[PDB]
């Protein structure tokens, strides 16, 4: 009773129903470095301007 | 200071938009008006300086230097308009523009609060001064003189820029008012020894210090009259003014770092005074007299006493008017005989009786006859130098003796004796020349009535 698969049948992507659990860390990664703190807040003008030597703006 | 900066800038349009034959009249009239308003800077208080804004301030050190600067501009214009008579019109307007821009840089130099703003204008004064000497000088050697002037200055100025920038990194500010309160002592170390030299050697070259002076007699012999007036009257005093400011942050290292420079000055003033006795060029003689007078100013600044700074301020003002007057007097002779040799034209009191009076008055101030402000400045420096070390009175006394010797030698050689037979083009003194001399001497003698206004912040 074996039927031969048609053209394109065996290149299909199928779903597999398995009791095996999904691995958590397949790459054995270490802990990622913590990100740099994200700067937040209202952007205000520079205090007394550029402050380059004698410039007052 | 805008009430002085803006009108000074307006002199440029005035000259350029003036009718072809009114450039000297218009610039002279309105530069005199600016000099008049400069007296409003005399609003000085006992405790606090006059601080206008974040950029400019005026104390009793800068105020007399500002008034001398703005007074000198109209005087420079009168002195220049005769030897520039044949100059091209547009080149006349460019000559006046160089002088106006020199005044602009000078008044902002003497009033800048911050030392970097002072440095930039302190250096900006080179460009106009160099251009005047080299473009409008008379002889071949004006090109070498411009180069020695430029590179002597910069060889000292560039280390100063590095030192000033380093000071702002460590102190956090170069504002002079701020430095008065955040000044910290300078301890011994080779890093501080070179910081001291970097801060001081640019100003030493401007004074000039003995040893580093050989550029000055070159510039004076080659500059046009207006160049020599500003160079002697004001530009030399940039070095003294900067020293009186920057020594604030160099203590106590000045206690021992000053020794090599006091010895150069004390001995240098005797050497340069004696050189004046054997000079053949009248302009070179007057040049070498400035080196001698400014040696006293260097010593006074370096010993740091209330009397020495008061004497230092009076000398810089007194010297400025006297040296400028002497250059004008010699130039008036030059405009006739077209030579700077002192022995060429003799016995001129016979032919120009009133100009011999100006020669006499200028010589009497130059040798510091009392009670001229020339002597008030000299005496205060001698009083303080005596307390520094009693032996200095010997060097100080010798210099006064020699100072009188060449001052009257120059008067006797050019004005007295028999006139030179073959020089027959000595015209009567012009009203322009007589007014030029009187506008030097009359303020100089008037200041003996109210000498406090030139004694400086420690009065
Ligand atoms: C001339 C150019 C060719 C030769 C190269 C010039 C450098 C050689 C001369 C030595 C200069 C001294 C020096 O190197 O200063 C180093 C010192 C660094 O110390 P630092 O790392 O700052 O310590 C912690 C404090 N913040 O710096 C300091 O601590 C402060 C020093 C202030 C800045 C000094 C600038 C150098 C001045 C050298 C010339 C001085 C003499 C000028 C002579 C002019 C003559 C007309
Ligand atoms: C016109 C040129 C004029 C030139 C004037 C020359 C001035 C000469 C100043 C000599 C003193 C220099 O500054 C001197 O430096 C060293 C820093 O290394 C300091 O001394 C310090 O370091 C040295 C390292 O050799 C140690 O020996 C010493 O134990 C330590 O205290 C001195 O306490 C200080 O006095």
Curated annotation (Swiss-Prot), chain A:
Subunit structure: Complex I is composed of 45 different subunits.
Signal peptide: none
Free-text note on domains in this protein's UniProt record: Contains four C-X9-C motifs that are predicted to form a helix-coil-helix structure, permitting the formation of intramolecular disulfide bonds.
Protein name: NADH dehydrogenase [ubiquinone] 1 alpha subcomplex subunit 8
Name of the gene this protein is made from: NDUFA8
Annotated region (Disordered), positions in chain: 18-44
Transmembrane segments: none
Function: Accessory subunit of the mitochondrial membrane respiratory chain NADH dehydrogenase (Complex I), that is believed not to be involved in catalysis. Complex I functions in the transfer of electrons from NADH to the respiratory chain. The immediate electron acceptor for the enzyme is believed to be ubiquinone.
Biased composition, class Basic and acidic residues, residue ranges: 31-44
Highest taxon above the source species: Eukaryota
Cellular compartments annotated: Mitochondrion inner membrane; Mitochondrion intermembrane space; Mitochondrion
Family: Belongs to the complex I NDUFA8 subunit family.
Curated annotation (Swiss-Prot), chain B:
Catalytic activity, EC: 7.1.1.2
Source taxon at top rank: Eukaryota
Membrane association type: Multi-pass membrane protein
Biological process according to GO: aerobic respiration; electron transport coupled proton transport; mitochondrial electron transport, NADH to ubiquinone; mitochondrial respiratory chain complex I assembly
Reaction it catalyzes: a ubiquinone + NADH + 5 H(+)(in) = a ubiquinol + NAD(+) + 4 H(+)(out)
Keyword DNA repair in record: no
Function: Core subunit of the mitochondrial membrane respiratory chain NADH dehydrogenase (Complex I) which catalyzes electron transfer from NADH through the respiratory chain, using ubiquinone as an electron acceptor. Essential for the catalytic activity and assembly of complex I.
Subunit details: Core subunit of respiratory chain NADH dehydrogenase (Complex I) which is composed of 45 different subunits.
Gene: MT-ND4
Predominant subcellular localization, coarse grouping: mitochondrion
Keywords: Electron transport, Formylation, Membrane, Mitochondrion, Mitochondrion inner membrane, NAD, Respiratory chain, Translocase, Transmembrane, Transmembrane helix, Transport, Ubiquinone
Localization: Mitochondrion inner membrane
Transmembrane stretches, start-end: 22-42, 60-80, 94-112, 116-138, 147-167, 196-216, 224-244, 256-276, 284-303, 308-330, 351-371, 393-413, 435-455
Gene Ontology cellular component terms for the protein in this record: mitochondrial inner membrane; respiratory chain complex I
Name of the protein this chain belongs to: NADH-ubiquinone oxidoreductase chain 4
Family: Belongs to the complex I subunit 4 family.
Sequence positions bearing N-formylmethionine: 1
């Amino acid at each position: 009773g074996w039927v031969r698969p048609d053209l394109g049948d065996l290149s299909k992507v199928t779903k597999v129903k398995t009791d095996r659990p999904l691995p958590e860390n397949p790459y054995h990664s270490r802990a990622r470095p913590e990100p740099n703190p994200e700067v937040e807040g209202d952007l205000k003008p520079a205090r007394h301007g550029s402050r380059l030597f004698f410039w007052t703006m | 200071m805008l009430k002085y900066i803006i009108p000074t800038i307006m002199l440029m349009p005035l000259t350029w938009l003036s009718k072809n034959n009114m450039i000297w009249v218009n610039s002279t009239a309105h530069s005199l008006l600016i000099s008049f308003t400069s007296l409003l800077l005399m609003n000085q208080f006992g405790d606090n300086s006059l601080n206008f804004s974040l950029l400019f301030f005026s104390d009793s050190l800068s105020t007399p230097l500002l008034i001398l600067t703005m007074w000198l501009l109209p005087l420079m214009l009168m002195a220049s308009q005769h030897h520039l008579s044949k100059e091209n019109l547009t080149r006349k307007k460019l000559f006046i523009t160089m002088l106006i821009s020199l005044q602009l840089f000078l008044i902002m130099t003497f009033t800048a609060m911050e030392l970097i703003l002072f440095y930039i204008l302190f250096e900006a004064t080179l460009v106009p001064t160099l251009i005047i000497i080299t473009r409008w000088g008379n002889q071949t050697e004006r090109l070498n003189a411009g180069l020695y002037f430029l590179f002597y200055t910069l060889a000292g100025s560039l280390p100063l820029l590095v030192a000033l920038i380093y000071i702002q990194n460590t102190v956090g500010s170069l504002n002079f008012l701020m430095l008065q309160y955040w000044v910290q002592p300078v301890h011994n170390s080779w890093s501080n020894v070179f910081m001291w030299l970097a801060c001081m050697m640019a100003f030493m070259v401007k004074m000039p210090l003995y040893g580093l002076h050989l550029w000055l007699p070159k510039a004076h012999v080659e500059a046009p009259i207006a160049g020599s007036m500003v160079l002697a009257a004001v530009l030399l005093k940039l070095g003294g003014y900067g020293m009186l400011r920057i020594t604030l942050i160099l203590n106590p290292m000045t206690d021992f770092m000053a020794y090599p420079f006091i010895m150069l000055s004390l001995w240098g003033m005797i050497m340069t005074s004696s050189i004046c006795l054997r000079q053949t060029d009248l302009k070179s003689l007057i040049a070498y007299s400035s080196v001698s007078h400014m040696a006293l100013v260097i010593v006074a600044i370096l010993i740091q006493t209330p009397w020495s700074y008061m004497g230092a301020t009076a000398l810089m003002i007194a010297h400025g008017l006297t040296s400028s007057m002497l250059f004008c007097l010699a130039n008036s002779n030059y405009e006739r005989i077209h030579s700077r040799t002192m022995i060429l034209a003799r016995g001129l009191q016979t032919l120009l009786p009133l100009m011999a009076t100006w020669w006499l008055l200028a010589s009497l101030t130059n040798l510091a006859l009392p009670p001229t402000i020339n002597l008030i400045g000299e005496l205060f420096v001698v009083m303080s130098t005596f307390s520094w070390s009693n032996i200095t009175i010997i060097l100080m006394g010798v210099n006064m003796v020699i100072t009188a010797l060449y001052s009257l030698y120059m008067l006797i050689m050019t004005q007295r004796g028999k006139y030179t037979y073959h020089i027959n083009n000595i015209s009567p003194s012009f009203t322009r020349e007589n007014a030029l001399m009187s506008l030097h001497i009359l303020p100089l003698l008037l200041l003996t009535l109210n000498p406090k206004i030139i004694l400086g912040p420690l009065y």
